[PDB]
Amino acid sequence: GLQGGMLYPQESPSRECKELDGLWSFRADFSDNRRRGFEEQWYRRPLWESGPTVDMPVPSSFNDISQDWRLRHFVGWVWYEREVILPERWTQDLRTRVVLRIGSAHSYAIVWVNGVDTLEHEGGYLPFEADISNLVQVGPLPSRLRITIAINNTLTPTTLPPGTIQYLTDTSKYPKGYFVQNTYFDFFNYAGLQRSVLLYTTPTTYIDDITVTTSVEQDSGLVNYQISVKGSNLFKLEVRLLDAENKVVANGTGTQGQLKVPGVSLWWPYLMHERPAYLYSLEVQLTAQTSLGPVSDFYTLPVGIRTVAVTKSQFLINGKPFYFHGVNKHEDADIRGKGFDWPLLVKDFNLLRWLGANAFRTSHYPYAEEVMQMCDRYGIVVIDECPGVGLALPQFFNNVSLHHHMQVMEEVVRRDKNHPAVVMWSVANEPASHLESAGYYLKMVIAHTKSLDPSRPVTFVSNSNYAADKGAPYVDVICLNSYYSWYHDYGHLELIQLQLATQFENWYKKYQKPIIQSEYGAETIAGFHQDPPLMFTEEYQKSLLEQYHLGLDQKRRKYVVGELIWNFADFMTEQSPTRVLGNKKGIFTRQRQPKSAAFLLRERYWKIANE
Amino acid sequence: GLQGGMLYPQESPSRECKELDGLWSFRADFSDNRRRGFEEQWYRRPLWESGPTVDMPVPSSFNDISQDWRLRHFVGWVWYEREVILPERWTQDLRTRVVLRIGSAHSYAIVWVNGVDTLEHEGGYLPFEADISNLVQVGPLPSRLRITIAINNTLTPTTLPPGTIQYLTDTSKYPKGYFVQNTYFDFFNYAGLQRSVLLYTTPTTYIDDITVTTSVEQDSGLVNYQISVKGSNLFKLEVRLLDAENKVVANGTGTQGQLKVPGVSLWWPYLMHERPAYLYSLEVQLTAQTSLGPVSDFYTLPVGIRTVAVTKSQFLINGKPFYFHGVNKHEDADIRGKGFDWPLLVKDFNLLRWLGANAFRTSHYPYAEEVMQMCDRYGIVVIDECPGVGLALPQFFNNVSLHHHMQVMEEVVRRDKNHPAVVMWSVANEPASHLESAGYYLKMVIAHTKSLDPSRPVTFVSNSNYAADKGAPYVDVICLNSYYSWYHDYGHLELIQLQLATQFENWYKKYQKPIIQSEYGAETIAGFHQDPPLMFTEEYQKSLLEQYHLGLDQKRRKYVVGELIWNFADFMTEQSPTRVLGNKKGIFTRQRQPKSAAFLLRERYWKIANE
Amino acid sequence: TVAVTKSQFLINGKPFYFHGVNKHEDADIRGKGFDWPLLVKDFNLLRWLGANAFRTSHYPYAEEVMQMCDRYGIVVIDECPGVGLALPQFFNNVSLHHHMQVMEEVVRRDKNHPAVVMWSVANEPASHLESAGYYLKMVIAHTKSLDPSRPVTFVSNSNYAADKGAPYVDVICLNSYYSWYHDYGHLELIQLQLATQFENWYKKYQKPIIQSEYGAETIAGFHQDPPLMFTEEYQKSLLEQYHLGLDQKRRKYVVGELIWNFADFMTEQSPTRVLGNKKGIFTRQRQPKSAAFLLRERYWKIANE
Ligand SMILES: *[C@@H]1O[C@H](CO)[C@@H](O[C@@H]2O[C@H](CO)[C@@H](O[C@@H]3O[C@H](CO[C@H]4O[C@H](CO[C@H]5O[C@H](CO)[C@@H](O)[C@H](O)[C@@H]5O[C@H]5O[C@H](CO)[C@@H](O)[C@H](O)[C@@H]5O)[C@@H](O)[C@H](O[C@H]5O[C@H](CO)[C@@H](O)[C@H](O)[C@@H]5O)[C@@H]4O)[C@@H](O)[C@H](O[C@H]4O[C@H](CO)[C@@H](O)[C@H](O)[C@@H]4O[C@H]4O[C@H](CO)[C@@H](O)[C@H](O)[C@@H]4O)[C@@H]3O)[C@H](O)[C@H]2NC(C)=O)[C@H](O)[C@H]1NC(C)=O
Ligand SMILES: *[C@@H]1O[C@H](CO)[C@@H](O[C@@H]2O[C@H](CO)[C@@H](O[C@@H]3O[C@H](CO[C@H]4O[C@H](CO[C@H]5O[C@H](CO)[C@@H](O)[C@H](O)[C@@H]5O[C@H]5O[C@H](CO)[C@@H](O)[C@H](O)[C@@H]5O)[C@@H](O)[C@H](O[C@H]5O[C@H](CO)[C@@H](O)[C@H](O)[C@@H]5O)[C@@H]4O)[C@@H](O)[C@H](O[C@H]4O[C@H](CO)[C@@H](O)[C@H](O)[C@@H]4O[C@H]4O[C@H](CO)[C@@H](O)[C@H](O)[C@@H]4O)[C@@H]3O)[C@H](O)[C@H]2NC(C)=O)[C@H](O)[C@H]1NC(C)=O
């Protein structure tokens, strides 16, 4: 675990304000260099004063909310700013700890709050917190916090997702300063503040970081806890566990211990128990004798008790077989890009249950916070990925890159190691794992996640030829991508069934382990129908899907333990001849309306769920 | 002005919390009667305990976020609930005034907060506030506010929008308890909490209600103010006015006065000044000797100085001619229904400027709060309507209804009488104004708005035959709806030009006043093209639009002072053979993508704006 | 042999059952135009659906009749024009006599085709009139004084007990559009409003029925859960309820069903009409819609019992 701690801001005796939503002053900086953004030090004086500002909502990518194409396709530094009114009690009580938090930035964020640079963060789709209390009480008066944040370009060889810039000196074509951003992943690299931006508070001695690990021992389960405090010297920690509402069912005492909750009541996925995702709540209460007396702090952490093992043929949750029949989603939708949205979150979770998908994959990057949604009665199992996307070029597998991927895997695991929904990790999606250097890098990143977190298996999804895949000897469960009929053998659904059964036989015969069909599908646009299936047509999709399902059924109850149709929905991708206004490969439209294939998938998922 | 006061919660020395966003427990109540919602008194014990609850986001209509058709088309009582954590200072300082506010409910809302029924409100698309401080400090301890709200059906003969229920006792057709909601307006009656839900605080003696009226007197303008306080006895009011940033440019002192700000700097609409919507800020500071000493309160109200007159031929803003070339919008979008959304607000305001529309009409009902958006540099003039929609049946014009419309017009005017953007009121849209009773009712409602607010003209838009329209002698400016080629003379764009010029001549020749083409357009779906224009086709729309513009150009610089193409975008309507998945009459799709007609409109709007 | 009971349509003595469609002579560019490419394509989709029947919607076609007889075996309902008989104006003797003439031309053109199992004198005319009940009286009569080899009928969209022409036909043709046209979007209402409509008509006319028209208008790329309007899904929900209903009367006394159109076709202009009628299960350009698939599972199913 990296030097710090992370728990999600959820008020109780010590609350949270939130500009996590709202309008914001904004500005893009360009014409040539990194530009004046820093050569004029815009940070030391209200953006408006610097030059022509604009409005920006949060959470929301700035890409689509405007009418200007150069902002849509910008690469460089981008600014924000907001003027908060600090409560009086905020700035005059010394027991309160006021922390600024961001749910996510881009490849680089610089926050200028506390009369200066207060925070910086590198890449990731993850959050970062600053300050302890210090709100520049030293010479101020009217508590008005001025926040400024600067953010960066699409990608680089050392970040994740990986990219590559490249200038093109007027070779008869391309203007003077023309440069381009080359990327190797299937999605548009949206930017801007797309998640939570909320100021919050705790006492000075706060429950910095808990952590629970669970299991099952006949007479019920038993939550094992770890806690971390920050400060004082003198304090006391006593934890208690309440069931469905608040029936106190257990109590421990220390900054380390156990909790054997009898009666039992595990966290089952939408799949099996009639009463699935069962959440018990852990109440961490700490009383510390600080400077100005013994202050207290509480947190309460939803604890879901469940076990996740694996064999050479079958995946097992709560010690019983579990077949994955879910989907791969994404954070995308008209206007807002990847910005967080409560209604689109709710619709999407009603559709998942509507379909009968009891699981999904954090498609190429960690998600908002809704991993708690997976926890709630919902019971939607999750395969958590980190941005190891376009790891195709051999250069992207250099040692700094490897050190970086080990950093990001500590953050991703920090943030989601508490969710009973997450049952597996993914360190990468379709890397050049056939390459020799990459197999090393993979064993590295992977063996590293096995440490830090020994509770659930690790893996990386691949489109690599068996026998040609170098990383595969190190994954605990096989994840395969194959688009037979698509990408190759254009229009040949008569081949799918054949080419499939083999890929599985070859994979298991070599690597003795559970395979998951982590990706399959055809690019379909609505309103296109052709009797003989043909191209980007609704029936074709029903045909490939139908045929793929045909191959999964032969080995499903053997060593194939999962199924993830490609996309839940259509999303935006970078502009290419093969991409028609994005990746039209989803069973639901971008506006969550179903396609003919959806109904079909819904039938299978429910049939299986009933077996 | 009705017994109360309303100002928008905007923190300063006395802040605001906000669950205005978030997830919420929810439940619809039905199977027959008003049902058990009250016969079991669900309000006196956590919804979960009552029965099977569900999640609901706010702001968002509950109509579309689910997969169940009976929730989509429900009529009756609907519940919500949330458990807030009250700050300690919240509940232990007696100087703080903690008010619960809702941005809007439906035809009926019942809020159960303060250990009981704390608030109720009838219809409208407007807000309501409760409590003063009383947070049940009397016998509580851990400040956890439990809020409950119940909401009602689609419509009735006395509400606004007007409706009619009707049972149909199994006449061979229709099941046992089958009843239907008959309505007479062109939109889907979405429900649920669709706007702000935010708890806030002030001291006990607070600036309850200000109000400014402005003008121009050669050497600059002069803001005239009114203030209202609530409580104490002893206090002092001194106001000051700062320009573009904070150059103090004026100061007054009292709870009534003037403010003659020299140098001048009026609020111009996107239309004319290169520096348009200029907002000065008014700082209301009040110090009152209460119980526990002289507490203070501040508000700061954006004041935009501008004058709006009218003649028998031309409309005049800032004393110069002003031609309306805007649009009619709506609150609607995939998933969220009519829920508030910051990114969709920003996109929509970029498109308005993109088009060149310097004005819009609050299409059949008051909008969220974004009337401040109209104020901001944007400078987007606004014609504010109240829900006088399906006033078609003669029954809907009964005396209680008339009293009601006078109530709602006090609220609508309370809430928006401060916006320098609003330049006109509309008390109704297409009423049966030919009917005799309705003309009386209209003169009533109208003469009533002229009182309360004598700053800007009043009107109601009509599709009534001149000579047949009874209310028309009472409007200050004529608003006409006509869909020549559409609705009649199906496909005859060769007639538009003819039928138009006449409607105008007949209207002005009788009624000597400025006409505004408040509505025109053709139902167009994207991807449909036909050389000879034809039906629901993009070219046809370019043709009718093109032809309508042809008729407006003849009288535009005479007595026709405005233009409002029908819809900015496509929206959802109740299901009918004439409505294809809603009102497809907009120049932009539901997802804000432009149609071929948009480009055309954009050209005209900009051409005119340049004249 | 083409017989007819009080409860069934007999073909060579073995009880029959129409499970086809209602078509039209409408194509892109060529409109009413005729050609073998579309002609053949159509018969291909026809055998495809399992449609073993089809009515010549509102007029006598071109040489498809040669085709139905031809190596196919698609039992047609030969239909004379006489469809817009809305106004009582259209009820004078002059025109009664005019209609009278065409039934000669039409039988004089199709007498021999084995395909044409039955004549249909008109479609959705103002049958609720006593004068119309007499106009239709004369022609139903005359038609059988021209061809006593097969039944006669006229497509009705009136309520039972107001149909003046109902007492003369030999098989009733009912045009219901529940959920559509009325009680907009109410799928849950269909199954019943339809039972009742087959309960009634029979309790009085005692003849065998044919659901000659049904469906919903649909724009191809449209999709929506909670079915909704001109949506592919809605059609799947409507069609389904109609099928769940007819199934109750099948084997009983209903002897056929005819999903409105085979494909979309142009119409005159109206805010109710998108770019002609859209109620078709194949696009104007002959491609399937989702339901085109749901109908054919019905057809082969039925044809297999
Ligand atoms: C926030 O956003 C920032 C903006 O995106 C971002 O900065 C950018 O980072 C990327 C990341 O790599 C940089 O991209 C690389 O650029 C290298 C070239 O760098 C040098 O040249 C730059 C451009 O300079 C010209 O243009 C400027 C803009 O007008 C002018 O100011 C200059 O005067 C100069 O003028 C020319 O350009 C115009 C016309 O084209 C016009 O001005 C004039 O007529 C003239 O033609 C410089 O800006 C840059 O400056 C930095 O470094 C120098 C010292 O090194 C300092 O003096 C500066 O202060 C500054 O620190 C450089 O001088 C490319 O080499 C590089 O390509 C190689 O690597 C990529 C992978 O990224 C490969 O795909 C590619 O094939 C190349 O491969 C090379 O390496 C391989 C091994 O991997 C090797 O085998 C092979 O041989 C090969 O050499 C890539 O394009 C980009 O330059 C930065 N932009 C800017 C504006 O600085 C910043 O990082 C972001 N912040 C964060 C934290 O993310
Ligand atoms: C929150 O949501 C609530 C739910 O929507 C909402 O309440 C509803 O308000 C509407 C508003 O009008 C009401 O609609 C009117 O209903 C009148 C009939 O009312 C009476 O009958 C109701 C139904 O009762 C049957 O059904 C119940 C449900 O199953 C059973 O419990 C009953 O036992 C009864 O059974 C029958 O129904 C079933 C089968 O159909 C089945 O149960 C059984 O087999 C049997 O067949 C009663 O609920 C209602 O009760 C109220 O009033 C009585 C006393 O009067 C009390 O005892 C009750 O406690 C309760 O307070 C009534 O008994 C209609 O008359 C009315 O139609 C007329 O008006 C409309 C305009 O609205 C016209 O369009 C229409 O043409 C009619 O016109 C009439 O007036 C004109 C003048 O304008 C006149 O010229 C003409 O002659 C004509 O008479 C309309 O349909 C609806 O009933 C309420 N629903 C419920 C469930 O109560 C509530 O208001 C919302 N809250 C707020 C604040 O908005």
Short mmCIF file of N, CA, C and O in Angstrom, two decimals, chain A residues 11-12 15 17 20-23 48 55 57 60 64-67 85 89 245 334-336 341-344 346-347 350-351 353-354 373 377-378 591, chain B residues 11-12 15 17 20-23 48 53 55 57 60 64-67 85 89 245 334-336 341-344 346-347 350-351 353-354 373 378 591:
data_model
loop_
_atom_site.label_atom_id
_atom_site.label_comp_id
_atom_site.label_asym_id
_atom_site.label_seq_id
_atom_site.Cartn_x
_atom_site.Cartn_y
_atom_site.Cartn_z
N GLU A 11 -20.38 11.57 5.12
CA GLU A 11 -20.67 12.26 6.39
C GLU A 11 -21.32 11.48 7.49
O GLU A 11 -22.10 10.54 7.26
N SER A 12 -21.16 12.06 8.67
CA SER A 12 -21.64 11.51 9.94
C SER A 12 -21.07 12.57 10.93
O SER A 12 -21.13 13.79 10.61
N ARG A 15 -18.87 16.02 8.55
CA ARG A 15 -19.42 16.15 7.19
C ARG A 15 -18.61 16.49 5.90
O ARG A 15 -17.39 16.42 5.85
N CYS A 17 -19.00 19.14 2.23
CA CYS A 17 -19.57 20.15 1.36
C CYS A 17 -19.32 19.56 -0.03
O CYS A 17 -18.65 18.53 -0.14
N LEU A 20 -19.04 19.36 -6.19
CA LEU A 20 -18.97 18.14 -7.00
C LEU A 20 -19.86 18.22 -8.23
O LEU A 20 -19.86 17.29 -9.04
N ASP A 21 -20.70 19.25 -8.20
CA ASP A 21 -21.65 19.64 -9.23
C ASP A 21 -21.64 21.18 -9.28
O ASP A 21 -21.21 21.83 -8.34
N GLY A 22 -22.01 21.76 -10.42
CA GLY A 22 -22.06 23.21 -10.52
C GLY A 22 -21.42 23.76 -11.77
O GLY A 22 -20.88 23.01 -12.55
N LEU A 23 -21.43 25.07 -11.94
CA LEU A 23 -20.84 25.70 -13.11
C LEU A 23 -19.44 26.10 -12.69
O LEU A 23 -19.19 26.20 -11.50
N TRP A 48 -10.55 35.12 -14.91
CA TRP A 48 -11.13 36.14 -15.74
C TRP A 48 -10.14 37.22 -16.13
O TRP A 48 -10.02 37.57 -17.31
N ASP A 55 -17.77 28.98 -19.31
CA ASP A 55 -18.38 28.17 -18.25
C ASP A 55 -18.21 26.69 -18.47
O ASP A 55 -18.36 26.21 -19.59
N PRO A 57 -19.47 22.77 -16.66
CA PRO A 57 -20.14 21.99 -15.61
C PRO A 57 -19.27 20.86 -15.09
O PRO A 57 -18.36 20.42 -15.76
N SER A 60 -18.30 16.62 -15.94
CA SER A 60 -18.53 16.58 -17.38
C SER A 60 -17.29 16.85 -18.20
O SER A 60 -16.53 17.79 -17.91
N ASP A 64 -17.54 17.57 -25.55
CA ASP A 64 -18.81 17.78 -26.26
C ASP A 64 -19.75 18.91 -25.87
O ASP A 64 -20.67 19.21 -26.64
N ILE A 65 -19.58 19.55 -24.71
CA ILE A 65 -20.52 20.61 -24.35
C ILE A 65 -20.39 21.95 -25.08
O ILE A 65 -21.14 22.89 -24.80
N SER A 66 -19.48 22.01 -26.05
CA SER A 66 -19.25 23.23 -26.81
C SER A 66 -19.52 23.00 -28.29
O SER A 66 -19.78 21.88 -28.71
N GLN A 67 -19.43 24.06 -29.10
CA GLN A 67 -19.67 23.94 -30.53
C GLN A 67 -18.40 24.04 -31.35
O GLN A 67 -18.45 23.89 -32.57
N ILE A 85 -17.43 29.56 -0.46
CA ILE A 85 -17.69 30.35 0.75
C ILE A 85 -17.53 29.36 1.89
O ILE A 85 -18.37 28.46 2.08
N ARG A 89 -17.36 28.24 10.98
CA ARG A 89 -16.90 27.15 11.82
C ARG A 89 -15.82 26.35 11.11
O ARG A 89 -14.99 25.71 11.74
N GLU A 245 -30.28 -3.65 9.10
CA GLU A 245 -30.69 -2.32 9.51
C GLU A 245 -29.71 -1.86 10.55
O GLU A 245 -28.79 -1.09 10.23
N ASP A 334 -24.24 11.06 -24.51
CA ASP A 334 -24.40 12.33 -25.21
C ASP A 334 -24.12 13.50 -24.29
O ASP A 334 -24.30 13.42 -23.10
N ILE A 335 -23.56 14.56 -24.85
CA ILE A 335 -23.22 15.78 -24.11
C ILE A 335 -22.15 15.66 -22.98
O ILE A 335 -21.05 16.22 -23.10
N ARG A 336 -22.47 14.94 -21.90
CA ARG A 336 -21.60 14.78 -20.72
C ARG A 336 -20.31 13.97 -20.84
O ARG A 336 -19.54 13.88 -19.86
N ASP A 341 -23.18 10.92 -13.54
CA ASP A 341 -24.60 11.23 -13.66
C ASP A 341 -25.45 10.22 -12.87
O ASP A 341 -25.39 9.01 -13.12
N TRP A 342 -26.27 10.71 -11.95
CA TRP A 342 -27.09 9.79 -11.20
C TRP A 342 -28.21 9.13 -11.98
O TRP A 342 -28.37 7.91 -11.88
N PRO A 343 -28.98 9.89 -12.77
CA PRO A 343 -30.04 9.17 -13.50
C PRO A 343 -29.50 8.12 -14.52
O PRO A 343 -30.01 7.00 -14.58
N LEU A 344 -28.46 8.46 -15.26
CA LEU A 344 -27.92 7.48 -16.20
C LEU A 344 -27.34 6.29 -15.46
O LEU A 344 -27.28 5.20 -16.02
N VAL A 346 -28.73 5.03 -12.61
CA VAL A 346 -29.91 4.23 -12.22
C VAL A 346 -30.52 3.43 -13.40
O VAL A 346 -30.73 2.20 -13.28
N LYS A 347 -30.73 4.10 -14.54
CA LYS A 347 -31.27 3.46 -15.76
C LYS A 347 -30.42 2.22 -16.08
O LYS A 347 -30.93 1.12 -16.14
N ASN A 350 -30.93 -0.67 -13.96
CA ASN A 350 -32.24 -1.28 -14.13
C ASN A 350 -32.16 -2.17 -15.36
O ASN A 350 -32.72 -3.27 -15.38
N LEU A 351 -31.42 -1.72 -16.38
CA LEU A 351 -31.23 -2.49 -17.62
C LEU A 351 -30.41 -3.76 -17.38
O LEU A 351 -30.69 -4.78 -17.97
N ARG A 353 -30.29 -5.55 -14.63
CA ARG A 353 -31.20 -6.51 -13.99
C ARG A 353 -32.24 -6.93 -15.01
O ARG A 353 -32.68 -8.09 -15.01
N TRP A 354 -32.63 -6.00 -15.88
CA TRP A 354 -33.60 -6.29 -16.94
C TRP A 354 -33.09 -7.40 -17.85
O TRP A 354 -33.83 -8.29 -18.24
N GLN A 373 -22.66 0.54 -5.85
CA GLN A 373 -23.92 0.18 -6.49
C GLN A 373 -23.87 -1.35 -6.71
O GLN A 373 -24.85 -2.05 -6.47
N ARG A 377 -28.11 -4.25 -2.84
CA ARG A 377 -28.97 -5.39 -3.19
C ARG A 377 -28.71 -5.92 -4.62
O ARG A 377 -28.82 -7.11 -4.90
N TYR A 378 -28.31 -5.00 -5.49
CA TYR A 378 -27.98 -5.30 -6.85
C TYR A 378 -27.17 -6.56 -7.00
O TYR A 378 -27.52 -7.40 -7.82
N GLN A 591 -28.35 6.03 -26.15
CA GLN A 591 -29.41 6.53 -25.26
C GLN A 591 -30.21 5.42 -24.53
O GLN A 591 -31.35 5.61 -24.13
N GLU B 11 -25.37 31.00 -0.90
CA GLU B 11 -24.52 31.21 0.28
C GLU B 11 -23.61 32.41 0.29
O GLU B 11 -23.12 32.87 -0.75
N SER B 12 -23.21 32.71 1.51
CA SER B 12 -22.36 33.86 1.84
C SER B 12 -22.33 33.74 3.40
O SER B 12 -22.22 32.59 3.92
N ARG B 15 -24.76 29.92 4.78
CA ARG B 15 -24.78 28.90 3.72
C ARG B 15 -25.96 27.95 3.37
O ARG B 15 -27.11 28.15 3.77
N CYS B 17 -26.67 23.58 2.38
CA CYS B 17 -26.34 22.17 2.18
C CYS B 17 -27.19 21.80 0.97
O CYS B 17 -28.00 22.63 0.52
N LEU B 20 -29.88 18.17 -3.23
CA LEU B 20 -30.44 18.62 -4.51
C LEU B 20 -30.10 17.67 -5.64
O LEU B 20 -30.55 17.88 -6.78
N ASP B 21 -29.17 16.77 -5.31
CA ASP B 21 -28.66 15.70 -6.14
C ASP B 21 -28.46 14.47 -5.22
O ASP B 21 -28.40 14.62 -4.01
N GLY B 22 -28.49 13.26 -5.78
CA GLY B 22 -28.27 12.08 -4.97
C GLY B 22 -29.26 10.97 -5.22
O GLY B 22 -30.17 11.15 -6.01
N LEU B 23 -29.13 9.85 -4.53
CA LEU B 23 -30.03 8.73 -4.71
C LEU B 23 -31.08 8.88 -3.63
O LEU B 23 -30.83 9.58 -2.65
N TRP B 48 -38.74 1.84 3.94
CA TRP B 48 -38.38 0.45 3.78
C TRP B 48 -39.27 -0.48 4.58
O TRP B 48 -39.79 -1.47 4.04
N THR B 53 -39.21 -0.95 -1.32
CA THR B 53 -38.76 0.31 -1.88
C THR B 53 -37.82 0.20 -3.10
O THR B 53 -37.35 -0.89 -3.46
N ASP B 55 -34.77 2.80 -5.68
CA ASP B 55 -33.92 3.99 -5.71
C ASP B 55 -34.37 5.02 -6.70
O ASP B 55 -34.75 4.67 -7.83
N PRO B 57 -33.08 8.98 -8.40
CA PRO B 57 -32.18 10.14 -8.43
C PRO B 57 -32.93 11.46 -8.44
O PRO B 57 -34.08 11.51 -8.82
N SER B 60 -34.76 14.34 -11.27
CA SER B 60 -35.12 13.44 -12.36
C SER B 60 -36.53 12.90 -12.27
O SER B 60 -36.97 12.47 -11.20
N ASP B 64 -39.06 7.74 -16.92
CA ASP B 64 -38.16 6.97 -17.76
C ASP B 64 -36.98 6.20 -17.17
O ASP B 64 -36.41 5.36 -17.87
N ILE B 65 -36.59 6.44 -15.92
CA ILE B 65 -35.44 5.72 -15.38
C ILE B 65 -35.66 4.26 -15.00
O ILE B 65 -34.73 3.60 -14.52
N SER B 66 -36.86 3.74 -15.26
CA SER B 66 -37.18 2.36 -14.94
C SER B 66 -37.55 1.58 -16.19
O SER B 66 -37.64 2.14 -17.27
N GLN B 67 -37.79 0.27 -16.05
CA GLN B 67 -38.15 -0.56 -17.19
C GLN B 67 -39.61 -0.96 -17.18
O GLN B 67 -40.07 -1.61 -18.12
N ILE B 85 -27.64 14.10 7.62
CA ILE B 85 -26.82 14.20 8.84
C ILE B 85 -26.65 15.70 9.06
O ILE B 85 -25.95 16.39 8.30
N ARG B 89 -23.43 22.23 14.61
CA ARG B 89 -23.67 23.66 14.68
C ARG B 89 -25.05 23.99 14.12
O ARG B 89 -25.65 25.00 14.48
N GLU B 245 -17.01 43.77 -11.50
CA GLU B 245 -16.28 42.94 -10.56
C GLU B 245 -16.71 43.38 -9.19
O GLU B 245 -17.55 42.72 -8.56
N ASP B 334 -33.50 12.44 -22.87
CA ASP B 334 -33.44 11.01 -22.62
C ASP B 334 -33.18 10.72 -21.15
O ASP B 334 -32.56 11.49 -20.47
N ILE B 335 -33.75 9.63 -20.66
CA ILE B 335 -33.59 9.20 -19.27
C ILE B 335 -34.15 10.15 -18.16
O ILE B 335 -35.11 9.80 -17.46
N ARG B 336 -33.53 11.33 -18.00
CA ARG B 336 -33.88 12.31 -16.96
C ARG B 336 -35.23 13.05 -17.03
O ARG B 336 -35.55 13.83 -16.12
N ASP B 341 -30.21 19.51 -15.09
CA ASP B 341 -28.91 19.00 -15.53
C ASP B 341 -27.98 20.15 -15.95
O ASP B 341 -28.30 20.93 -16.84
N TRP B 342 -26.80 20.22 -15.34
CA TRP B 342 -25.90 21.28 -15.72
C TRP B 342 -25.28 21.14 -17.10
O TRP B 342 -25.27 22.12 -17.85
N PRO B 343 -24.78 19.95 -17.46
CA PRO B 343 -24.20 19.90 -18.82
C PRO B 343 -25.24 20.15 -19.95
O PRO B 343 -24.97 20.91 -20.90
N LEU B 344 -26.43 19.58 -19.84
CA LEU B 344 -27.43 19.83 -20.88
C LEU B 344 -27.84 21.29 -20.89
O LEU B 344 -28.27 21.79 -21.92
N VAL B 346 -25.65 23.83 -20.28
CA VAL B 346 -24.54 24.51 -20.97
C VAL B 346 -24.55 24.32 -22.50
O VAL B 346 -24.50 25.31 -23.27
N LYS B 347 -24.71 23.07 -22.95
CA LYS B 347 -24.79 22.72 -24.38
C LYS B 347 -25.87 23.59 -25.04
O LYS B 347 -25.58 24.34 -25.96
N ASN B 350 -25.00 27.07 -25.59
CA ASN B 350 -23.95 27.25 -26.59
C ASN B 350 -24.64 27.18 -27.96
O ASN B 350 -24.29 27.94 -28.87
N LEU B 351 -25.65 26.30 -28.08
CA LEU B 351 -26.42 26.16 -29.33
C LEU B 351 -27.25 27.40 -29.63
O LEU B 351 -27.37 27.78 -30.78
N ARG B 353 -26.54 30.51 -28.83
CA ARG B 353 -25.61 31.52 -29.34
C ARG B 353 -25.11 31.05 -30.70
O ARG B 353 -24.89 31.88 -31.60
N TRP B 354 -24.97 29.74 -30.87
CA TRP B 354 -24.54 29.16 -32.15
C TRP B 354 -25.52 29.52 -33.25
O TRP B 354 -25.13 29.87 -34.36
N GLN B 373 -29.17 32.37 -16.10
CA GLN B 373 -28.33 32.07 -17.25
C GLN B 373 -28.68 33.11 -18.33
O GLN B 373 -27.79 33.66 -18.98
N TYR B 378 -24.70 36.04 -21.49
CA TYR B 378 -25.56 35.47 -22.48
C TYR B 378 -26.54 36.47 -23.05
O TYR B 378 -26.67 36.55 -24.26
N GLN B 591 -31.13 14.71 -28.71
CA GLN B 591 -29.74 14.72 -28.20
C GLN B 591 -28.90 15.92 -28.71
O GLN B 591 -27.68 15.85 -28.77
#
